[PDB]
């Protein structure tokens, strides 16, 4: 009767940034989706592959759950098919995805009146991201014939610009936390059911 | 919540010793635990932030150890001026909560 830890991943303090998104593997549940459904302020609660109302009696085998912090505008890009800055270089979903995308509005919790520069995002990559793949390669793009030995400047650019998140910005640039549930059914006896 | 069992709640120690504390959690709290002390009817002060790092203002002999879930506060060369009760307060999930008090007297 061990209720599996959505509490370790929903009401947590410091969600990681989007370039290194932590991936909690939830397993051996008796998962109760009645604890997150009773909430007004969810900005998006879209689901794919399963209707969100009847999530109780649908037995899966593994339920991956991700987390990051993005702008309010770019929650549009956490969706199957859309491309841009976040779903190309930071966190890409495949177009057979079978889970839910949940957001918030955390401006009170994740933004001081000065520059909160603790969240980073990726600006470029040599190729687009394979679905569910994370890169922590914080190495300078060389981009010229000269090697520049890890100090940026002309012709050598850093691959992680910083978020700022001041609370005088906007409803679309104050930071929106996002937790992505992902359900899957790989060929093993049932594990997650409430 | 994250209930923090502090055992033992009291210590009958002598001056000039090396003493060990304990704040064992229930859920995993990766180095997001802080430690406090509170004397007889005052306001608590800060000792160590993020479970190992020290702050100026206190003596440098105070040292914080342990990571993962198991946390022990080891202070050596304990002298007279450290009578009181010692706290641990985590920060990882919500709501934040503090331990049930570990008091430190002198023989």
């Amino acid at each position: 009767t061990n209720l599996c830890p959505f509490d370790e991943v929903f009401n947590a303090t410091r969600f990681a940034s989007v370039y290194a998104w932590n991936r909690k593997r939830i397993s051996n549940c008796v998962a109760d989706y009645s604890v997150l459904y009773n909430l007004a302020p969810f900005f998006t609660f879209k689901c794919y592959g399963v209707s969100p109302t009847k999530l109780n009696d649908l037995c899966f085998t593994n339920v991956y759950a991700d987390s990051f912090v993005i702008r309010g505008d770019e929650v549009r890009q956490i969706a199957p098919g859309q491309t841009g800055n976040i779903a190309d270089y930071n966190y890409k979903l495949p177009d057979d995805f079978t889970g839910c995308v949940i957001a918030w509005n955390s401006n009170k919790l994740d933004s001081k009146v000065s520059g909160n520069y603790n969240y980073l995002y990726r600006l470029f990559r040599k190729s687009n991201l394979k679905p569910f793949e994370r890169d922590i390669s914080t190495e300078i793009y060389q981009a010229g014939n000269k090697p520049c030995n890890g100090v940026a400047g002309f012709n050598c650019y850093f691959p992680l610009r910083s978020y700022s998140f001041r609370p005088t910005y906007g409803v679309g640039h104050q930071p929106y936390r996002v937790v992505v549930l992902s359900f899957e059914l790989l060929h093993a006896p049932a594990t997650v059911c409430g | 919540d994250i209930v923090l069992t502090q055992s033992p709640a009291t210590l009958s120690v002598t001056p000039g010793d090396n003493v060990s504390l304990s704040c064992r959690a229930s859920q995993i709290i990766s180095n997001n635990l802080h430690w406090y002390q509170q004397k007889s009817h005052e306001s608590p002060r800060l000792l160590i932030k993020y479970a190992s790092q020290s702050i100026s203002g206190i003596p440098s002999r105070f040292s914080g150890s342990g990571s993962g879930t198991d946390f022990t506060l080891s202070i050596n060369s304990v002298e007279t001026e450290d009578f009181g009760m010692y706290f641990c307060q985590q920060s990882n999930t919500w709501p934040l909560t503090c331990g049930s008090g570990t008091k430190l007297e002198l023989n």
Partner: nanobody
Amino acid sequence: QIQLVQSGPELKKPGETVKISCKASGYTFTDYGLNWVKQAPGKGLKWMGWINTYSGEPTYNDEFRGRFAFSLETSTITAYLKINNLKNEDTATYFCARGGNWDWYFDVWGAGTTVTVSS
């Protein structure tokens, strides 16, 4: 010089409202929070909940959901813990501690307000 002065002791009757001030001094007020923590005599601390000092919106614990209110005014730098309908079992000592918006360790505290209710 960075301290947080408070009010003095209060002595109320069960049903009266109570008001506790917590004035900041020295640091920029909008750079942190004001976590409010209740210490009963003979027990440990309990984080009642915090308040963003720039916005003004509280976030209470699930223990103290109703029956409390963190108000705020920024003309005079002061937070309030405004209890309505005081009861008997909350004879305690109410602090106010400046924990950050990214850290959550209460490092700069106040001297302590005491609300012992009686008849």
